[PDB]
Write a protein that binds this ligand. Structure first.
Ligand SMILES: [Zn+2]
Ligand SMILES: [Zn+2]
Lengths: 373, 373
C-alpha cells in the first residue's frame, strides 16, 4: 500500500463512497472512527473494536501527552504497539481539549501554554510541538494544529481565529514535511474554520487548498449550534473543499447527523459515546435510541436491537444489560459500548452500500422515517 | 452425564485429582471457581471466563436475591440463560454476605431477617428460602444454609452455632429433596463448622455424614485466622469428611493457600480478587505477586508473567497495563482480571498434572521456593 491514496468508487448527489489506502490498512468511506482517549477505546479490546467493523480509530493527543506521555510512548515503540491496534490511527492535534479540559491557559500567536487537569503540571502546544507529539505517537493521519473558535463567535473574532488557524496550518505543513519519516509514512489533514460565516469558510478553504493537504476537516461544528445550523453551514462549506480529498467532520455525531452530513459530502466521522446523567445506558436501535436503565426493560428478553448483527445482540437480553448498567457492573459498559460501536459501523456499511447502489437518498429517507417514528 | 458423579483418578498423600460429572458439564479437580457476584464475573464475558480454563463459576445468592431478584431470574429462564454461562454454577447460601454486608439483622432458629444494603428493603433467609432461591436461580451445586461462626469464637458459641448449623443442614437436605426438579438435576453440599475446635469439627462431620450430602465444605475459615492456623484446622478437619465426596474450602484463597489446602485434601476453591487500597493492581506471577501500579513498571515491556499462556500476556505489556490501571480505565480491570483468573487456572492445571504424575509434593516445594524467593 501507498502512504496515502483516496479513491472515490461511487457517488450520489454530494455523497461519495470509496477507500483510503494507507500503509497500515484500507479505510472504507464514509467511515466512523471510534475514539481512543488515553490509548484505549473505552471498555473494548482492540480485537473487539476491529470485530465491530472499524478500519481506523482516533487517538486524543491531549490525553496521551499528559498520560502516559508522548516521549514515553515513543520509547515503548509507538501507540499502535502500546495499545495493540495495528491498523491506521488518526490523532487530533490536542488543541480542542486544551481549551475544554485544561486550566490557566495562555494563548498567543506561538501556541498555548496550559496546566494539566490531572496534576496542574505545566504543558505547551504549538503547531510544531503538536506535529512532533503526533509523530512520537506514530500517528497515521496527523491533524494540523488550529485555534478553537467558540460558538457563538462574532464575525471579527471568527475571522481572527480563522486567520491564525491558517497561519498555523502552514506551520503544521512545514513541520510535518521537515520530518522525513513522518512525511513519507503518514498523512496530514488541514482544518477549515470560519464559524457560521460563508465568506470566512471560503477564505479558509482557499488558504488550505493553496497549502495543500491529504484531507480536509470541517472544524468548528458540533459545539452547540444545533442540527439545522450545522447542516446549513455544511451546505456551503463542504463544496469549497477539494473534491478529490477526504472531508472529515470532526466530532460528529448522532446517527441522523451522520446521514445528513454524508448527504452533504462528508467522508469521515468521530464522536464519543455519552455517559453523563445515565446516558451511559443509551443504546442505539433502528427505531431510535433507548435508555436501557428504564424500568420497562427489566424483563425484556429481546436483544438491544432486533436486526443488529453484533455479538451482544446475539448473546444477551435487554433485561440482562439493564441489570448490569443499574448495578454499575463493568460488563454493562463493555456490552453497551460494543453494541453501540457495532451499530455505528452497520450504519456506515448501509450508507456505503446504498451510495454504491445509487439508492442512498432513499436509504436516508427510510432511515429517518423509522428512526424518528 | 449423570446428575452428579465424583471420580478420583489419582492420589498423592492426602491430595486427590479427578472429575465431577454433572448435567451441564465436567469439573476437573482440584478446581478453582471464579466468583460471579450479581450475575457477572467482574469485567469478563463468560466466554473469556471459559477461555481461562474455568469449568464452573460461583454465584452469590445474597447479591442475586437483592438485584435483580430470584423470582425475576426464574421468570427470565434462570441464571445460566440470564448471564450466558452454560456450564455448572455453584451458588452459596447467601448467609455469609447477610452477616457481612446487610444491616439490622435479626437472627433466630428459623433463619435471619435483614435490611438490604442497597435500599434498606427488608428480606429473609432460612434453610427453606435459601434452597428455594438457589432453585429459582437454577443452581447446579446448592449449598446448605448455615449460621456464620465469627473468628475468634469461644468454645460455647462455636458449639452452639455448629449445632444450629447441623439442624439447618437437615432442613436444607429436606427442602432440596422435596423439590423433585431440584433433587433430580442439582447437587447439595453440606458445610462443616466448629471453628478451630477438633471435637466440634468431628461432631459436625459426623452429623453431615449421617444426613448425607453430595459434597462437603469446610466452612468457617478464611476469616482472619492466618495460614498456620487454617492449615492446622485443615490437618484434622478434612480427614473427618467422607473420602469419596468432594471437599470444598470456601473463600480460599491466595495461591499458596490453595497449594497447602490441596496437600491437606481439598478439591474445590473460590475467592474474590482484591481491589481495595490499590490492590486492583495486584497481578499474580510465578515469582510472587506484583502491583502493576508501581512506578517501576511504567516502561517495562515484559508481560505480567514470563510464562503465563493467557491472552493478556501474549498481547500487552506491563507498561500498558500500568498506564490503564493508573488512569482508571475499564480495559485495565478487564486485562488484570483475565490474567489473574488465567493464572489461577494454570496453577490448578499444574496441581492436577503433578498429582496425576505422583510429583505433587515436589511441585509444591518448587512452587513455594520460587513464589517466595
Ligand atoms: Zn437479528
Ligand atoms: Zn510465555
Amino acid at each position: 500500500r501507498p502512504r496515502f491514496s483516496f479513491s472515490i468508487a461511487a457517488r450520489e448527489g454530494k455523497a461519495r463512497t470509496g477507500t483510503i489506502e494507507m500503509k497500515r490498512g484500507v479505510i472504507r468511506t464514509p467511515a466512523f472512527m471510534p475514539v481512543g482517549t488515553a490509548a484505549t477505546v473505552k471498555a473494548l479490546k482492540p480485537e473487539t473494536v476491529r470485530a465491530t467493523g472499524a478500519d481506523i480509530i482516533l487517538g486524543n493527543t491531549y490525553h496521551l501527552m499528559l498520560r502516559p506521555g508522548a516521549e514515553r510512548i515513543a520509547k515503548l515503540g509507538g501507540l499502535h504497539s502500546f495499545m495493540g491496534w495495528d491498523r491506521p490511527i488518526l490523532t487530533d492535534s490536542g488543541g480542542f481539549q486544551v481549551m475544554s479540559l485544561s486550566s490557566l491557559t495562555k494563548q498567543s500567536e506561538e501556541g498555548v501554554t496550559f496546566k494539566s487537569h490531572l496534576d496542574g503540571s505545566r504543558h505547551m502546544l504549538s503547531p510544531e510541538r503538536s506535529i512532533e507529539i503526533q509523530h512520537l505517537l506514530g500517528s497515521d493521519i496527523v491533524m494540523a494544529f488550529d485555534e478553537v473558535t467558540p460558538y457563538p463567535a462574532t464575525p471579527s473574532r471568527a475571522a481572527s481565529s480563522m486567520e491564525r488557524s491558517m497561519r498555523w496550518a502552514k506551520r503544521s505543513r512545514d513541520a510535518f514535511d521537515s520530518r522525513k519519516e513522518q512525511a513519507e509514512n503518514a498523512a496530514l489533514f488541514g482544518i477549515q474554520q470560519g464559524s457560521v460565516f460563508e465568506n470566512l469558510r471560503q477564505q479558509s478553504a482557499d488558504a488550505l487548498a493553496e497549502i495543500g493537504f491529504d484531507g480536509y476537516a470541517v472544524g468548528g461544528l458540533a459545539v452547540g449550534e444545533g442540527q439545522d445550523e450545522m447542516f446549513r453551514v455544511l451546505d456551503f462549506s463542504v463544496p469549497m473543499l477539494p473534491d478529490d480529498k477526504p472531508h472529515y467532520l470532526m466530532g460528529v455525531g448522532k446517527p441522523d447527523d451522520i446521514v445528513g452530513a454524508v448527504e452533504r459530502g462528508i467522508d469521515m466521522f468521530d464522536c464519543v459515546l455519552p455517559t453523563r446523567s445515565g446516558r451511559n445506558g443509551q443504546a442505539f436501535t433502528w427505531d431510535g435510541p433507548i435508555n436501557i436503565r428504564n424500568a420497562r426493560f427489566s424483563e425484556d428478553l429481546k436483544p438491544l436491537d432486533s436486526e443488529c448483527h453484533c455479538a451482544v445482540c446475539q448473546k444477551w437480553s435487554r433485561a440482562y444489560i439493564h441489570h448490569l448498567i443499574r448495578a454499575g457492573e463493568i460488563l454493562g459498559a463493555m456490552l453497551m459500548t460494543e453494541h453501540n460501536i457495532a451499530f455505528y459501523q452497520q450504519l456506515m456499511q448501509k450508507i456505503r452500500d446504498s451510495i454504491s447502489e445509487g439508492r442512498f437518498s432513499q436509504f436516508a429517507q427510510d432511515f429517518r422515517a423509522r428512526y424518528f417514528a
